[PDB]
Amino acid sequence: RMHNKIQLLSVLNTHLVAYPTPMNLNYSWNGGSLAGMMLASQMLTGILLAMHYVGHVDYAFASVQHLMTDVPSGMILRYAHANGASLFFIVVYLHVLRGMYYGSGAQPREIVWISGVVILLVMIITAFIGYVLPWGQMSFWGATVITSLATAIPVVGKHIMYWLWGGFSVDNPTLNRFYSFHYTLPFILAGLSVFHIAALHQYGSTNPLGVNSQSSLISFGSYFGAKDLVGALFLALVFSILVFFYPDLLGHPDNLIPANPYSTPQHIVPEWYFLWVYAILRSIPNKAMGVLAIGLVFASLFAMPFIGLGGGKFRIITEWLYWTFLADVLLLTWLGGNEITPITSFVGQCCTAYLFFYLLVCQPLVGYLETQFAHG
Amino acid sequence: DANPFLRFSNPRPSPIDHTPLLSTLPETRITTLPNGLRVATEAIPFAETTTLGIWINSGSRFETDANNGVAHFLEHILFKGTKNRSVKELEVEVENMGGQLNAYTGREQTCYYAKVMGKDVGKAVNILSDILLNSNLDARAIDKERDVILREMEEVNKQTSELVFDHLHATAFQYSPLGRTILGPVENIKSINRDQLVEYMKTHYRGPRMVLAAAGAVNHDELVKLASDAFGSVPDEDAATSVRSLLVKEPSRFTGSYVHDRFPDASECCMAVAFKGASWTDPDSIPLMVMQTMLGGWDKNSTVGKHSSSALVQTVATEGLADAFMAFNTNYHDTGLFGVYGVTDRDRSEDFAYAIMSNLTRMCFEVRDADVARAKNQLKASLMFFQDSTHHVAESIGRELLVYGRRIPKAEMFARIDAVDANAIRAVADRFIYDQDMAVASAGDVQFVPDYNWFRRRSYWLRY
Amino acid sequence: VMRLSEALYQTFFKRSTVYIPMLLVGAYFSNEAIDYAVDKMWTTRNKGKLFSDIIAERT
Amino acid sequence: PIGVWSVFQGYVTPARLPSIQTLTRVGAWGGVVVVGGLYMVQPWDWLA
Amino acid sequence: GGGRVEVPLSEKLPAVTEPPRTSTPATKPIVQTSSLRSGVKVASINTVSPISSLVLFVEGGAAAETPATAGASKVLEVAAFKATANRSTFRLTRELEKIGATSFARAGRDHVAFGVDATRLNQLEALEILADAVVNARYTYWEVRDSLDAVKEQLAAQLRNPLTAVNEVLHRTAFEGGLGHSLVVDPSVVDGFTNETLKEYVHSIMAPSRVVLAASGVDHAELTALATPLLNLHGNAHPAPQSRYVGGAMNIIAPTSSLTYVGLAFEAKGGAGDIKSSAAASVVKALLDEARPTMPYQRKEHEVFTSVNPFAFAYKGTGLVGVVASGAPGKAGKVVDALTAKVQSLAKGVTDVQLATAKNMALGELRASVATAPGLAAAVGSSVLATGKFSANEVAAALSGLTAADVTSYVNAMIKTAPTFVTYGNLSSLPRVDSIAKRFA
Amino acid sequence: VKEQLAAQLRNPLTAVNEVLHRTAFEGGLGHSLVVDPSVVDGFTNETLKEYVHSIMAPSRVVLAASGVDHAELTALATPLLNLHGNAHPAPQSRYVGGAMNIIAPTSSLTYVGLAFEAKGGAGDIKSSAAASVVKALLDEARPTMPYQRKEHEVFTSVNPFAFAYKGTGLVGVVASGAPGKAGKVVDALTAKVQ
Numbered sequence A: 001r002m003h004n005k006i007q008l009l010s011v012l013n014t015h016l017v018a019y020p021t022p023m024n025l026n027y028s029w030n031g032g033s034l035a036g037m038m039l040a041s042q043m044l045t046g047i048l049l050a051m052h053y054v055g056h057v058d059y060a061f062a063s064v065q066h067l068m069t070d071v072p073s074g075m076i077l078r079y080a081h082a083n084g085a086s087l088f089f090i091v092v093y094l095h096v097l098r099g100m101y102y103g104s105g106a107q108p109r110e111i112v113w114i115s116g117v118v119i120l121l122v123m124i125i126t127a128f129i130g131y132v133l134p135w136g137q138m139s140f141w142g143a144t145v146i147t148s149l150a151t152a153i154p155v156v157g158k159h160i161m162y163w164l165w166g167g168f169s170v171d172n173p174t175l176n177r178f179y180s181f182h183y184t185l186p187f188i189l190a191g192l193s194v195f196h197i198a199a200l201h202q203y204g205s206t207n208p209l210g211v212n213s214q215s216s217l218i219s220f221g222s223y224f225g226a227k228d229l230v231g232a233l234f235l236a237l238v239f240s241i242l243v244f245f246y247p248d249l250l251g252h253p254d255n256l257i258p259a260n261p262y263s264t265p266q267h268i269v270p271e272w273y274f275l276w277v278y279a280i281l282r283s284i285p286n287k288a289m290g291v292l293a294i295g296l297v298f299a300s301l302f303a304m305p306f307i308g309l310g311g312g313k314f315r316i317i318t319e320w321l322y323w324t325f326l327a328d329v330l331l332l333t334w335l336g337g338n339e340i341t342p343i344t345s346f347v348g349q350c351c352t353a354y355l356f357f358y359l360l361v362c363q364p365l366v367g368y369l370e371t372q373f374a375h376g
Numbered sequence B: 001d002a003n004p005f006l007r008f009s010n011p012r013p014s015p016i017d018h019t020p021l022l023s024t025l026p027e028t029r030i031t032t033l034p035n036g037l038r039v040a041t042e043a044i045p046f047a048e049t050t051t052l053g054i055w056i057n058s059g060s061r062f063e064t065d066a067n068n069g070v071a072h073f074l075e076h077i078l079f080k081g082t083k084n085r086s087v088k089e090l091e092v093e094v095e096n097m098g099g100q101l102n103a104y105t106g107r108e109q110t111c112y113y114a115k116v117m118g119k120d121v122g123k124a125v126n127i128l129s130d131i132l133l134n135s136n137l138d139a140r141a142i143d144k145e146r147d148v149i150l151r152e153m154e155e156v157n158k159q160t161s162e163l164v165f166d167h168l169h170a171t172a173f174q175y176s177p178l179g180r181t182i183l184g185p186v187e188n189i190k191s192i193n194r195d196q197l198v199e200y201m202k203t204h205y206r207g208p209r210m211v212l213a214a215a216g217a218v219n220h221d222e223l224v225k226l227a228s229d230a231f232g233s234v235p236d237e238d239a240a241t242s243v244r245s246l247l248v249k250e251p252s253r254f255t256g257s258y259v260h261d262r263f264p265d266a267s268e269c270c271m272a273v274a275f276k277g278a279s280w281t282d283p284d285s286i287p288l289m290v291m292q293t294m295l296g297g298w299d300k301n302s303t304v305g306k307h308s309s310s311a312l313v314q315t316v317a318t319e320g321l322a323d324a325f326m327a328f329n330t331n332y333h334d335t336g337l338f339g340v341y342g343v344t345d346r347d348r349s350e351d352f353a354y355a356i357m358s359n360l361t362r363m364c365f366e367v368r369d370a371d372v373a374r375a376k377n378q379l380k381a382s383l384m385f386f387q388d389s390t391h392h393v394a395e396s397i398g399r400e401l402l403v404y405g406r407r408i409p410k411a412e413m414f415a416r417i418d419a420v421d422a423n424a425i426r427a428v429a430d431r432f433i434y435d436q437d438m439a440v441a442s443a444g445d446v447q448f449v450p451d452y453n454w455f456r457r458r459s460y461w462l463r464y
Numbered sequence C: 001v002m003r004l005s006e007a008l009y010q011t012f013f014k015r016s017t018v019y020i021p022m023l024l025v026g027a028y029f030s031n032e033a034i035d036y037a038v039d040k041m042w043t044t045r046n047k048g049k050l051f052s053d054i055i056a057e058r059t
Numbered sequence D: 001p002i003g004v005w006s007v008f009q010g011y012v013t014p015a016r017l018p019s020i021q022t023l024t025r026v027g028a029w030g031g032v033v034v035v036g037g038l039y040m041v042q043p044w045d046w047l048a
Numbered sequence E: 001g002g003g004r005v006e007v008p009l010s011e012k013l014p015a016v017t018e019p020p021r022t023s024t025p026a027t028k029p030i031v032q033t034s035s036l037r038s039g040v041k042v043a044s045i046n047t048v049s050p051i052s053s054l055v056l057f058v059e060g061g062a063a064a065e066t067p068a069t070a071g072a073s074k075v076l077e078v079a080a081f082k083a084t085a086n087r088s089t090f091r092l093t094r095e096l097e098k099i100g101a102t103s104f105a106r107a108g109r110d111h112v113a114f115g116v117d118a119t120r121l122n123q124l125e126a127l128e129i130l131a132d133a134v135v136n137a138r139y140t141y142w143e144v145r146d147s148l149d150a151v152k153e154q155l156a157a158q159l160r161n162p163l164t165a166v167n168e169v170l171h172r173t174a175f176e177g178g179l180g181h182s183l184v185v186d187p188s189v190v191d192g193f194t195n196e197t198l199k200e201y202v203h204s205i206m207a208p209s210r211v212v213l214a215a216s217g218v219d220h221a222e223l224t225a226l227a228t229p230l231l232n233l234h235g236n237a238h239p240a241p242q243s244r245y246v247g248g249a250m251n252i253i254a255p256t257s258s259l260t261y262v263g264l265a266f267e268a269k270g271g272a273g274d275i276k277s278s279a280a281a282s283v284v285k286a287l288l289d290e291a292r293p294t295m296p297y298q299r300k301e302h303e304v305f306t307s308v309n310p311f312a313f314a315y316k317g318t319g320l321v322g323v324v325a326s327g328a329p330g331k332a333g334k335v336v337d338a339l340t341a342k343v344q345s346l347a348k349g350v351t352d353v354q355l356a357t358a359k360n361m362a363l364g365e366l367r368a369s370v371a372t373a374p375g376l377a378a379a380v381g382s383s384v385l386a387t388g389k390f391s392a393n394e395v396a397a398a399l400s401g402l403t404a405a406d407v408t409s410y411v412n413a414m415i416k417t418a419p420t421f422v423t424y425g426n427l428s429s430l431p432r433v434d435s436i437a438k439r440f441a
Numbered sequence F: 001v002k003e004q005l006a007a008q009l010r011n012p013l014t015a016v017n018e019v020l021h022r023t024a025f026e027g028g029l030g031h032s033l034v035v036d037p038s039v040v041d042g043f044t045n046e047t048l049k050e051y052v053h054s055i056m057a058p059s060r061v062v063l064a065a066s067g068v069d070h071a072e073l074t075a076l077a078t079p080l081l082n083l084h085g086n087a088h089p090a091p092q093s094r095y096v097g098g099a100m101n102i103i104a105p106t107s108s109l110t111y112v113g114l115a116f117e118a119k120g121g122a123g124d125i126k127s128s129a130a131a132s133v134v135k136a137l138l139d140e141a142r143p144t145m146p147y148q149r150k151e152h153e154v155f156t157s158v159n160p161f162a163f164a165y166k167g168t169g170l171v172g173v174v175a176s177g178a179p180g181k182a183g184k185v186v187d188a189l190t191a192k193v194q
């Protein structure tokens, strides 16, 4: 064989052409290839964007405007890079919810789940510090509110805060270092994605039935190339609609105002994909307790392969509870864009309590009850 | 739960008191002749057979470079005719007493013994003294045995385990008398003669180095009279040429080293790893016995290896790392050897080596009490099994008088075993194993055996 | 020939959790000695040319 | 089935748990990270 | 710190002789036998040894096998002492290894034996473990399936020795019936074996009147009182295919046998039941011992032979005394001629010194077989199963009271009976079979 | 070579033929042809060269042909077959007979072979013709039609043979049967020749 004589062709053949895949995978197994396509699109658009962006105060806003109106195809590149972050987060969130529904992180795929959670954290940091770069009002004030939350760790507070800022407030050193960190972090994302895919290939994927599928495996490169192409074309349709018809629908109008450190906007909210964490933080009336709850959510995400029992269908109680969890998370996403009100504070506290209750009580105990019902 | 089939027995290891077994064990009587020869008997009350022989505190250690191999050649020559009996006369007289003569020659011990019936004690004494004192040592028989030994040397006719252990003694005891083989080199066999045999027997086979040990059906006074008649003419020993003076003059030395004997088309891969152990007189030799029981041994004809108490046996049997292995505890007059020998192939040699090293170093840190109680019970039961055969009773009498200087009673041995606990095991393992040099020997298909630095690195843990 | 002592081995070398803090205090003192030697040599060689020499001269 | 499934099935006994000596040897790593942090930062005579 | 008193020095005041010396029994202990109310016979002999041996003898072996259950005794040797109704395999292994006891399963040509050897302080544990592993054994599917491989290499290794193969073919040729079946079968015989085959074989061989409990160094009243609720057995006696001696001759073709093996055998009349005939057969076996290795490194040279190995088996009702001799491939007819000459010279008379030497050799073998506790327990169990009593004193008296005229008469009556003749090896030189069995006629 | 030998010894007829040729003869005719595969273990090309050198001599070689002119064949084989060698002595063979048995522990059929010497060998035309006729007579079950259903009471399969060598030969019959029916197979094979 021609692929048996060059080691590059052997690896590519083994992992992209002849890789045995279950034949009954539905269209909810296309999240990963879509996420990889969105990562590649973001990298390409950003590398093109960085040839016209200047990472300095008193030039950043004007460089973005010169990019928008004077660079040929520059408006397409900027709007694509802005809405691609939203579509990247949509796809990755649906991927995580698929894994939550089917119990995809269980033995022997715990490394796949853990590397996914690490990828999600790096994605969040990348998107935040990239949102600071246009240097509008929302960029400056979100960077101010989030980075001045290290004053919750006792003693070693404002020292870390002033070392992050490079000064005493968010200013030109903060923007200048945020440009370098934001350029650099997506390559770590690409390497972690390669490691994440390589960890899955050790044992292969789960199937919608939740049973062993070693008897019914087919080649990846013929059957799941066109199936991924169909979903990629749907994603390209949504992407083209967002770029060309509603380019500022998902944004905030305040980020089109140049940043003013002496005047604050009426409502300071982040992008939509950060809103559930913001609601968890804003609901608790203590800064250190809010940061502790935010850390506890991700700790419970890491602990999910070792505490979570229960998968998709034929485990029907946890299957029904998944929809309450999805409603809870979407409610937290809605609450983050509202104002602080006693009823919204009470509802956000109840939603955070139920999120912890589902992640830490329902998944082990109800799953154990389901195993005792089914095979006991 | 079955009422009659589930009482009395349970898998929880608990210490057993072996004190009531001491009430009926027989006593050893020792009589020292004016020659310096000790006569020691142990009468079993209703025995019909008798093992008796002569144990000598000599062997391959006390030779020189010029006559290395004389003591092993002596057991080829000694049974080929004496000055009072011919070959056929000896054969007929041994056949008529219904027993067999036998001989072993170690690095430090030699025995010649007879397993006869109780009516043939005096005849066996007379025959043993006749070969020991009045041998022909004919040059024709020497030439008739030299060529056979040279053929089996040219063919490399040897056991694999003996080959590995001889390499291990040669590399662990470099430039000391214990590094020589019992067989000797080819040149000494090619130039052996009657004079060297006479000089070796005249120098080393003397009164204070010889024990006449008999077990089974034997009277002590009659054996004293027979030994004074027969073995009364052995020379005494000079004070300047005693065993202790020779031990002081040429002491043992341990060197951390590595050897492998590679063959181009072999199938097996035999290997042994040993640490510098304890001498016979070290009080740490009893915990080393308990630790050797804790490591145990296993061969693949057994099918209950996965339910073993020993963790090393469990690991090797479950993962299939070796076809057979055994832990050994060798004791000498002034040094010793402690380690594990095993047989594997070239694809499982590194994992077997890792299992050996990881289980040896683990005894310094974590030792549970159940394993120690189990090993103490197994070692005491093994000591009681040797009391069942009169051959082992006579062998233990001879060995204990040669190397301890006295007959250790069974109550003292049980008390010394029962004083071992988990802290003692951890202390002895810390003394002998942790961050120490080891000796590595292998033979066969040994291209994938790790080198010395790999073995040296795994004698300690960086995580504690 | 020359050989590390057994009693000094059993204290500072057998465990890594005792070896590492000893390593850190030795590292601290080694850095202090190297700093002292370099600074003393530099100040002795360039005496009368530094700014502090002019300032102490003007007192 | 690594984690809470091991303790639901009864696979975590008083045996197969680490000993007190094992926990002390692991627990001795607490001083190493403290000394390493104090070596890295050097807040000399900062203890109140 | 631990103990630091060196072993040349006596241990200190914490080393007491608190157990006193128990007085010896007045006489040598005798064998005491009885029968349980279930029908199992129990025989025991007291010893002064600190080791108690318990063995369970069941009639069976290769003589109770069928073509369907072929090679079941060899599988039962490996599959014994595993998971029972009350204990798992892990629990039984740990309970044996806790008290330092050892277990064996050993299959003969007319019996299977199961035994546990332990110290005198753990005799109840050994008895309970042995009874539970024999009576309540489960013989699970997966354990037998995994043991079949090790059975195959053990049989393949045991068939590497040509004397085992010659013994198998000799027993096939000498007998028709139960004793002619093969014990050490080919490895491919047990290729289709399952646990149902072993369970069928065990159900055939097990019956209360075919089971004997033998013990060494155990009080008899205590043993019967504590084994009555444990050995309450039920079952039917499967019919036994009684064997008869007919004689004959056969051959074996071996492609890479560097030597050539010749077997000659006769029938010992009366079997193990007759004390005098078995004693005379043992004396004949010792008289055929040409090269006995009584000394280290002794080189007895024969003109033609390379090895001589006689035997004397004593089954129930019939026996097989004979000799197997090796030799060069080109000298096989000389091996046959020398063997016939040796048996004929034995028939011509034994001369005093040879008779005394063979009697001493037989007495030494008989007394060295029962020297240890497991050997004594095995001897008691086999003798009670074959006859109903243990008669080692009577066997010794028969060996000592044998005259040369009786031995000459015994060999004269032997050579009149038709013999059994078996060859082995890449046979490229052989006298014709009609003249082979003519020299004794 | 070893796998072909193992394939050939799987047929019990080949093994019975080998044992018959060894048992009936003393000399070169009793040597085994289809040897065990373990025999060819320590075999090299020097062993083959030694065997070829032992068998090669210009008086031991016959060039036969079919469908060619004889004069042209001799004219063209003149400069090719210039063989030089020493005529090694022939280990001549004599019939002795006897009885031997070969054990197969997992064979579902027991084979019985019977044979007699064809005196004269291939040189005697009349004796060879009589041996051929006796081989044809002993062939009880020769299927001459498709799906013939001949049924013997004891003979599972019957194969007669007739061999002709230089100076001697064999003619006889090999009959199989059930393992429990071998004595009746011997009885019928014996009674057939009277």
Ligand code: HEC
Pocket (backbone or CB within 6 Å): A029, A030, A031, A032, A033, A035, A036, A039, A092, A095, A096, A099, A102, A104, A105, A109, A112, A113, A115, A116, A117, A119, A120, A193, A196, A197, A200, A204, A205, A206, A207
């Ligand atoms: C927090 C969890 C998580 C995150 C975030 C995540 N993954 Fe996944 N991913 C998984 C799990 C679990 C699986 C295995 C699903 C299965 O086989 O049931 C998986 C499977 C995949 C697959 C195989 C096809 C598929 O969709 O099942 C790909 C490709 C993939 N991931 C890529 C990515 C990429 C690219 C990213 C981000 C840029 C990403 N994943 C983010 C957990 C995650």
Ligand code: HEC
Pocket (backbone or CB within 6 Å): A039, A042, A043, A044, A045, A046, A047, A049, A050, A053, A064, A078, A081, A082, A085, A088, A123, A126, A127, A130, A131, A132, A133, A134, A182, A183, A186, A187
């Ligand atoms: C996970 C999300 C994500 C990834 C991956 C990402 N970016 Fe962006 N980046 C953003 C967001 C969001 C913005 C804010 C865009 C806006 O609102 O105008 C941004 C802004 C920028 C800007 C400022 C110009 C502008 O129009 O805002 C540059 C330059 C840039 N990114 C470059 C890159 C580069 C270079 C890469 C990869 C090598 C990259 N990005 C990958 C999310 C991302």
Ligand SMILES: COC1=C(OC)C(=O)C(C/C=C(\C)CC/C=C(/C)CC/C=C(\C)CC/C=C(\C)CCC=C(C)C)=C(C)C1=O
Pocket (backbone or CB within 6 Å): A124, A125, A128, A129, A131, A138, A139, A141, A142, A143, A145, A146, A147, A164, A178, A181, A268, A269, A270, A271, A274, A277, A278, A281
């Ligand atoms: C309106 O306001 C707000 C924003 O603003 C628009 C936000 O976004 C968010 C969302 C942010 C969240 C939830 C936290 C983001 C996570 C972290 C860890 C903070 C980011 C940390 C930084 C910048 C420290 C410096 C580190 C850098 C630059 C990279 C480090 C390098 C590596 C890891 C290799 C919220 C809630 C918000 O209310």
Ligand SMILES: COC1=C(OC)C(=O)C(C/C=C(\C)CC/C=C(\C)CC/C=C(\C)CC/C=C(/C)CCC=C(C)C)=C(C)C1=O
Pocket (backbone or CB within 6 Å): A021, A025, A029, A030, A032, A033, A034, A035, A036, A037, A040, A197, A205, A220, A224, A228
């Ligand atoms: C459950 O079954 C499975 C699936 O579900 C059906 C999958 O989907 C996948 C994975 C799908 C893959 C790998 C294809 C999707 C694409 C990805 C991750 C990357 C996107 C890249 C694109 C479009 C082109 C990038 C181009 C260039 C030039 C960048 C490279 C740079 C250089 C050469 C310098 C796998 C393994 C799988 O098992």
Ligand SMILES: [Zn+2]
Pocket (backbone or CB within 6 Å): B072, B073, B182, B183, B184
């Ligand atoms: Zn030797």
